[PDB]
């Protein structure tokens, strides 16, 4: 029906396989740190009086003056990640809880406060992906959407892909919002690289410098008109619109991920 | 009523009539469909255009205005699909693609 | 004695694709041999296709199937596109 996460009462988007007793409740209470659900206000109050957790149950691998990043294993924190997946199904029609949370790593971005770190979004990641996906599921809370947070999450995902010395792509069945967000991110990164590079550059060099897959680069090039065939060859095409978009980008002065604040080493799984 | 070439009716440069005649006189079947020579001429024209385009690009890349067999060889052997199509064909005066094995280099 | 060839049509195509480029005689002979080769391959394959299905007429369908058999990937796709387009345009007028 409707859910109260922290101070924000949210209206769900899709079905989520919560206990039917919560589908029988008018209000659902969600802990802001443990993500525990409640139909009983008294149990919510008692839990808050006994809940001492004020940050994601994991190690902090990144922190700037605005947000911090936590790496959480689904196997180690099973209940918490199950809570996260249950909450995530509400906002994607396509999420699959047909499998438990063990083989998934969860990188959660939070904003710190006096009460603690407030989760605004995260992206999951398979411990061993056959397809080479660097993001499995990425959900950003609707009370924080359209704020550039998802852009920062994608930035952090590619920063991890660079720290893994790998290229990565999201799970290809992208949602419309996720597809548009990745279009924006790819376009902005490609334009920034092209303008700042100021030189002819190979595709493999772009993929190495951005950890973007070459397929993504090519599809964006087909959506854009960056690559043109002129005089028997394809060449960098510096048209007006590209520089105009680059100037609007420079004028917006959006938040960016600082790699030097990432104290993290890739996990080893047997 | 003046006559219009079947190539013009199909908007093609290759001779539809000659292809049809060669099909009839090639002992392939008792009967020949009307559209088969048109289809075959179109396919031949397309392949000719592809090869001539690649050869022209190679000739420009060698500062030449006249296509020579060397350009044809380079164009064919540099195209994966054309190379696969002509894997059992030898081009006279075609030469070889410049290719030096890494281990032989100092 | 008249000995026919494909030279003039190759020249027309070359003028349509590279109006400022010429061709040597030896290369024109090579192109003519290539055209004859492809023609023989496709006609033979079409003949076998007609025989397998116990047909006595070579239609456009057999040519299309032979092209799909002989040409790899995008070459086949574009050749089929060209053939269908040309046959349609011829059928129009």
């Amino acid at each position: 029906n409707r859910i109260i996460m922290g101070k924000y009462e949210i209206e769900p988007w899709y079905f989520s396989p919560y206990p039917i007793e919560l589908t029988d409740e008018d209000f659902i209470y969600i802990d802001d740190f443990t993500l525990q659900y409640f139909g009983s206000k008294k149990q919510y109050e008692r839990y808050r009086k006994k809940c001492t957790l004020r940050h994601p149950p994991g190690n902090e691998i990144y922190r700037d003056d605005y947000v911090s990043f936590f790496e959480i294993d689904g196997r180690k924190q099973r209940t918490w990640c199950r809570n996260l997946c249950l909450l995530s199904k509400l906002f994607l029609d396509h999420k699959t809880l047909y499998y438990d949370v063990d083989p998934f790593l969860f990188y959660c971005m939070t904003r710190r406060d006096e009460l603690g770190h407030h989760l605004v979004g995260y992206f999951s990641k398979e411990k061993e992906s056959a397809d080479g996906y660097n993001v499995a599921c990425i959900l950003t809370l609707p009370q924080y959407q359209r704020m550039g947070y998802g852009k920062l999450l994608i930035e952090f995902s590619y920063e991890l892909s660079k720290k893994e010395n790998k290229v990565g792509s999201p799970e290809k069945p992208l949602s419309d919002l996720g597809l548009l967000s990745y279009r924006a991110y790819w376009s902005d990164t490609l334009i920034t690289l092209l303008v700042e590079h100021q030189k002819e550059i190979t595709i493999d060099e772009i993929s190495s410098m951005t950890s973007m897959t070459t397929t993504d680069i090519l599809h964006t090039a087909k959506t854009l008109n960056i690559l043109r065939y002129y005089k028997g060859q394809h060449i960098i095409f510096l048209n007006e619109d590209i520089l105009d978009r680059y100037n609007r980008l420079k004028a917006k002065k959006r938040r960016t991920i600082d790699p030097n604040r990432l104290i993290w080493k890739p996990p080893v799984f047997t | 009523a003046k006559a219009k070439t079947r190539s013009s009716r199909a908007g093609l440069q290759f001779p539809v009539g000659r292809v049809h005649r060669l099909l009839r006189k090639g002992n392939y079947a008792e009967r020949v469909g009307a559209g088969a020579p048109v289809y075959l001429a179109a396919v031949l024209e397309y392949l000719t255009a592809e090869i001539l385009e690649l050869a022209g690009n190679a000739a420009r890349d060698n500062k030449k205005t006249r296509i020579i067999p060397r350009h044809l060889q380079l164009a064919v052997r540099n195209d994966e699909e054309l190379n696969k199509l002509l894997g059992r064909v030898t081009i006279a005066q075609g030469g070889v693609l410049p290719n030096i094995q890494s281990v032989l280099l100092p | 004695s008249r000995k026919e060839s494909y030279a003039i049509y190759v020249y027309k195509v070359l003028k349509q694709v590279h109006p400022d480029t010429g061709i040597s005689s030896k290369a024109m002979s090579i192109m003519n041999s290539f055209v004859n080769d492809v023609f023989e391959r496709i006609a033979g394959e079409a003949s076998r296709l007609a025989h397998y299905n116990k047909r006595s007429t070579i239609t456009s369908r057999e040519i299309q199937t032979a092209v799909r058999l002989l040409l790899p990937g995008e070459l086949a796709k574009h050749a089929v596109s060209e053939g269908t387009k040309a046959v349609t345009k011829y059928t129009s007028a």
Binding site: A221, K222 | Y46, E50, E53 | L75
Partner: peptide, 9 residues
């Protein structure tokens, strides 16, 4: 366009 190689390396 009629020809191949809409986008390659």
């Amino acid at each position: 366009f009629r020809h191949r190689k809409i986008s390659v390396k």
